[PDB]
Design an enzyme around this catalytic site. Structure first.
Site, PDB file in Angstrom:
ATOM      1  N   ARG A 168      -7.252   3.764   3.581  1.00 21.36           N
ATOM      2  CA  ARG A 168      -8.057   3.021   2.571  1.00 21.36           C
ATOM      3  C   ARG A 168      -7.846   3.688   1.206  1.00 21.36           C
ATOM      4  O   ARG A 168      -7.724   4.932   1.166  1.00 21.36           O
ATOM      5  CB  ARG A 168      -9.542   3.001   2.955  1.00 21.36           C
ATOM      6  CG  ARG A 168      -9.809   2.769   4.438  1.00 21.36           C
ATOM      7  CD  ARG A 168     -10.921   1.771   4.707  1.00 21.36           C
ATOM      8  NE  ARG A 168     -12.173   2.105   4.032  1.00 21.36           N
ATOM      9  CZ  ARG A 168     -12.996   3.098   4.377  1.00 21.36           C
ATOM     10  NH1 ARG A 168     -12.711   3.895   5.395  1.00 21.36           N
ATOM     11  NH2 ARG A 168     -14.108   3.298   3.688  1.00 21.36           N
ATOM     12  N   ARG A 180       0.096   7.725  -6.220  1.00 19.22           N
ATOM     13  CA  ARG A 180       0.966   6.965  -5.292  1.00 19.22           C
ATOM     14  C   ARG A 180       1.318   7.878  -4.113  1.00 19.22           C
ATOM     15  O   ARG A 180       1.245   7.405  -2.966  1.00 19.22           O
ATOM     16  CB  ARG A 180       2.230   6.454  -5.988  1.00 19.22           C
ATOM     17  CG  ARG A 180       3.218   5.762  -5.056  1.00 19.22           C
ATOM     18  CD  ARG A 180       2.671   4.507  -4.387  1.00 19.22           C
ATOM     19  NE  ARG A 180       2.927   3.312  -5.184  1.00 19.22           N
ATOM     20  CZ  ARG A 180       2.015   2.596  -5.846  1.00 19.22           C
ATOM     21  NH1 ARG A 180       0.732   2.928  -5.811  1.00 19.22           N
ATOM     22  NH2 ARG A 180       2.400   1.536  -6.543  1.00 19.22           N
ATOM     23  N   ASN A 207       2.000  -1.282   4.150  1.00 22.11           N
ATOM     24  CA  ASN A 207       2.631  -0.875   2.864  1.00 22.11           C
ATOM     25  C   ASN A 207       2.274   0.573   2.523  1.00 22.11           C
ATOM     26  O   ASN A 207       1.166   1.027   2.815  1.00 22.11           O
ATOM     27  CB  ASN A 207       2.225  -1.821   1.735  1.00 22.11           C
ATOM     28  CG  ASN A 207       3.051  -3.082   1.753  1.00 22.11           C
ATOM     29  OD1 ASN A 207       4.278  -3.021   1.822  1.00 22.11           O
ATOM     30  ND2 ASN A 207       2.390  -4.224   1.693  1.00 22.11           N
ATOM     31  N   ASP A 217       8.827 -12.217   1.251  1.00 26.15           N
ATOM     32  CA  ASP A 217       9.262 -12.382  -0.163  1.00 26.15           C
ATOM     33  C   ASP A 217      10.246 -13.549  -0.213  1.00 26.15           C
ATOM     34  O   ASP A 217      10.095 -14.421  -1.101  1.00 26.15           O
ATOM     35  CB  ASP A 217       9.900 -11.117  -0.731  1.00 26.15           C
ATOM     36  CG  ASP A 217       8.914  -9.995  -0.965  1.00 26.15           C
ATOM     37  OD1 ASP A 217       9.240  -8.875  -0.547  1.00 26.15           O
ATOM     38  OD2 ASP A 217       7.818 -10.264  -1.565  1.00 26.15           O
ATOM     39  N   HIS A 259      11.008  -3.929  -0.794  1.00 30.19           N
ATOM     40  CA  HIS A 259       9.947  -4.973  -0.801  1.00 30.19           C
ATOM     41  C   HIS A 259       9.088  -4.840  -2.067  1.00 30.19           C
ATOM     42  O   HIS A 259       8.685  -3.694  -2.404  1.00 30.19           O
ATOM     43  CB  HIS A 259       9.109  -4.865   0.483  1.00 30.19           C
ATOM     44  CG  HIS A 259       7.805  -5.588   0.461  1.00 30.19           C
ATOM     45  ND1 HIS A 259       7.704  -6.937   0.185  1.00 30.19           N
ATOM     46  CD2 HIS A 259       6.555  -5.164   0.733  1.00 30.19           C
ATOM     47  CE1 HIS A 259       6.444  -7.311   0.276  1.00 30.19           C
ATOM     48  NE2 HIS A 259       5.716  -6.241   0.604  1.00 30.19           N
ATOM     49  N   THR A 302      -4.258 -10.671   0.879  1.00 23.71           N
ATOM     50  CA  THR A 302      -3.341 -11.682   1.450  1.00 23.71           C
ATOM     51  C   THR A 302      -3.413 -11.502   2.964  1.00 23.71           C
ATOM     52  O   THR A 302      -3.510 -10.379   3.393  1.00 23.71           O
ATOM     53  CB  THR A 302      -1.924 -11.569   0.876  1.00 23.71           C
ATOM     54  OG1 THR A 302      -1.294 -10.400   1.373  1.00 23.71           O
ATOM     55  CG2 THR A 302      -1.879 -11.508  -0.626  1.00 23.71           C
TER      56      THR A 302
END
Lengths: 320, 327, 322, 331
Positions: free
Chosen positions: D98, D105, D137, D165, D192, D247
């Site tokens: 989370r 990053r 991801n 994609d 990606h 999404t």
């Protein structure tokens, strides 16, 4: 009273015009292969079968009805009288024996058009390009609504053969056969590819007699598929069946997918007579809405206008 | 090579394979229905008649664009059927004019003596599904010859019968066959048993609501619905010379339950020595649970005195032919 | 010349009048489960989504449109404005907030908008309480009763069949059982009609559905009553099962199958009920909605439970202001 | 006597060993869109959900169970404990750390590695022959993480990669040409998201190169702005996230498409993340999306796309970035 009145309380007057009806004209093995394939794809809420042999017609109908537990098409109806074919969105013509074929269609098409005036006509009968012109001429339908099977299945077969060589599934092998169904169809080597990679770039000898891998014979295999299956089991039924249900799915579901199907072409690809040839067509609820303009070598262009001449020649001498 | 300029290789026992034996109108109806429900990652056809076989296989191969069954193989040699999870037997001999019931079964036994041993050698863990008529006996024949345990040999039995029954029940009540429940059990053919008691729409007994149901007295002649089912093949063969579509849909329905281990209840032919007062090795149709290991459980229907008597007489008849078979 | 006009020759200007359009009203967890289930069963050529939250609506719409390659429903539209719902065969109501009165307030906007743009559509109400709010949509819409359906006990019966299947070791498809009347605490488990392969489990096991049953089958209908509540206290809401069960009704309607579903229909003049209320009974669902109702034989305890539900419902509906 | 014993006669002592099992790890909105799309395409005889939220996991499991009547997947199980996942053919990983506010990053990636240190060996324990399909991801990085921790050969580790994609890109193509996405072809490759490589040469309808019809296609000059169509994909997520917060539906559909190719052994070409050391001039152990042939053994072969010298730079660029990030990760 009656068991039905004890069990069930009727609160509505069966006001039933079908919303998603397909008719399959002719119950030869092709027609019944289109029927079974259409039924198993949940495309239609009513399927009608019409043919000249009343016993065979009823046999097929009863058999399909016996499968009703395993299908999602509740009404399946048959009859000699084209009244059963009424309010069809799609009428697939699979009946024939050439001037004789015309004369067969002069009975079929005025009757189809009487009872389903707003239908799409899918001509599968051979010779499919001429018989799609006859279907169009006789019906008075605008060309958007008269569709010929064309090279749809020839392209499906081509993609299979491409598949087995390259060792990948036919869905991921892209290839187009266009023009006149059979001997005179032009295999468009420039367009053949996998994941958008031109096979003509990697193998420039692709589409020549000299080629070691003889990819030109894969087109020879396609035009001679029908003959080779007819020599072995007496006819073809399954592949055309699955291909016609594919065209039906694009129409009923309005998918606007691109299929190599026979369309009235006059004014495109340098063709200036009323004929029908396979070119990539956008297929949906109003039939053929739009045609893709494929860039053709002048040899491919000539070959297509030769086909168009051959067809106009034969079509000129037909009596209506 | 184009294959090698376009694809780099970086790396074949099939996991969901079905074989159909016999490319008669039936086996092909079974084959197309199977492909069009995506039950199999591999389909094998086998038949003695070489041309027809190649031709049929090729006609399906050309439909590959429109399918999700990536490998279609055939051959007269049974090596092509290796490692099948399900093998569907449709090959047989049809009864000839004047031919006794024992001579018909015997002829099919002689055919099965070639088919079955070949099926077990290349696919020794497969379930067998026998469609070939007469299905109750020919299922026994395939059982004994295979030496398979009983769970793994299945007859199509009264699957299609119960289906045609649910269709006719639904054309009469004005609801879909899916919402009409009725079971035809015992011997496939004119000795079919229609369990009137278990007939319901929405779990409402039509026998309780209309006690005449099944009897001659009944003014709606429901007894002639069990006759319409008995005479369905007769009536279709008379009009079109054979049946194909409906049996196909029916078999593909059993294939699904097996391949996907659904444990759905179908009326199908199982060896039920020790149930419904049957004391010998016969195959009658009772409601069976169908999963990845074939028939695993049997539902015990309460039958009338009349009905368990019909099943004993069929079991007496079947054994009567079975004991007289030269294996 | 534009690439589009280089690649494609237009042969036909065409009017865009949809043939098999479904609308889902509300894009909460329930409405999107309905949407994805409908999309993946290929029941529609066009799906519309309508809700008040324009951001949520456009996002959900875009997220589906991005799966178009994997679907056979070629058009997905959305909007606060009910213009997008025009010419729906079927409009499914999943939206809602005295708690009854607030869902009525909401329905007094939603239902007239559905009717303006789809005068001929079927209405499938899902919002709770579902028997009352089906009644509300029927009163507000002025539609005939055959075209106003409530989801009712369609999910209760499905859960009951799963529960039945787990105890017997057979798939829910082969386990038959019917939960009828009011959706929730007061639903009626019809013990008589519970069967595998036409064997009456109540005949087989006469103590079935009574207190002194050591197999405790009456506690299995209390699991169906309590199912939502337990899944809600675990994951916050229920979505997947309702969504699949609603697509099932959608399939019957759009394909005109005439299958029998335990759905909520206006029942005045059946089962001894004399007021305007909606209760679940086996209904023949097709393209014109509910064409027929199966008359189920009930124990006197069952007839009474239903008539009592009809009194508590009609009494709640008396106090409502339209 | 017991009702089960009265009704049903057992003929066969049955020990379930499942033949077509799929595990979804993580029951976030993405896990559950993978779960429903897998269930609704009839690809599994058993489905196993796994996560760390005990309440949430059991609740989701039950909702799916409660629609078993409408499905063809007899067995839906769940648990915190990974034993529920034994004998999976395909384990789809959708779980991840989370986001903590004000985190780098790199600290985010490294928390996702520590999570995969718990998840992956537990997956391999109970399902040692499974194909891994990594969805979480960053997908190219965590697919490497999963390959290294697992010690599976590269053919059995797939990343979702640029699969969606490409599907997003084909939708967008569709809307501009007024044709279904099934009939518009274009490939999005490499890393990606933001660094995604759009292959203009490959883009067509009916084998008619769009780049040929319209040579400015791709360039900045081109007044039809086809380069913006590639940015519309990169950004698609970002805009859906602003509107609904996440999404789930599209990736669910697209993951299910990959599952189908594995479970039915289709050998269809999908733009998925594979370990391509040796291919495309890439020299280090990194995962990039190329057109891969997907089947019962995972990724069996890769298509060799003819790239422009530029597109070839972008891949290598992405391979240095990815190799650069992977060096600094504590396994």
């Amino acid at each position: 009273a009656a068991l039905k009145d004890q069990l069930i309380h009727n609160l509505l007057k069966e006001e039933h015009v079908p919303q998603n009806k397909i008719t399959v004209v002719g119950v030869g093995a092709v027609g019944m292969a289109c029927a079974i394939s259409i039924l198993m794809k949940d495309l239609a809420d009513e399927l009608a079968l019409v043919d000249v042999m009343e016993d065979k017609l009823k046999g097929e109908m009863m058999d399909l009805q016996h499968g009703s537990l395993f299908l999602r098409t509740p009404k399946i109806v048959s009859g000699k009288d084209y009244s059963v074919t009424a309010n069809s969105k799609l009428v697939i013509i699979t009946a024939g024996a050439v001037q004789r074929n015309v004369n067969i269609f002069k009975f079929i098409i005025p009757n189809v058009v009487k009872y389903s005036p707003h239908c799409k006509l899918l001509v599968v009968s051979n010779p499919v390009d001429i018989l799609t012109y006859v279907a169009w001429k006789i019906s008075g339908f605008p060309k958007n609504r008269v569709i010929g099977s064309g090279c749809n299945l020839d392209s499906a077969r081509f993609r299979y053969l491409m598949g087995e060589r390259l060792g990948v599934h036919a869905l991921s092998c892209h290839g187009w056969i266009l023009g006149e169904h059979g001997d005179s169809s032009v295999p468009v080597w420039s367009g053949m590819n996998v994941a958008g990679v031109s096979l003509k770039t990697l193998h420039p000898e692709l589409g020549t007699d000299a080629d070691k891998e003889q990819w030109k014979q894969v087109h020879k295999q396609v035009v001679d598929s029908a003959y080779e299956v007819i020599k072995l089991k007496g006819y073809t039924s399954w592949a055309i069946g699955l291909s016609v249900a594919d065209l039906a799915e694009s129409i009923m579901k309005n998918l606007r997918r691109v299929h190599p199907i026979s369309t009235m072409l006059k004014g495109l690809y340098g063709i200036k007579e009323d004929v029908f040839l396979s070119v990539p067509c956008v297929l949906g609820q109003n039939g053929i809405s739009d045609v893709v303009k494929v860039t053709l070598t002048s040899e491919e262009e000539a070959h297509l206008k030769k086909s168009a001449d051959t067809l106009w020649g034969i079509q000129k001498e037909l009596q209506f």
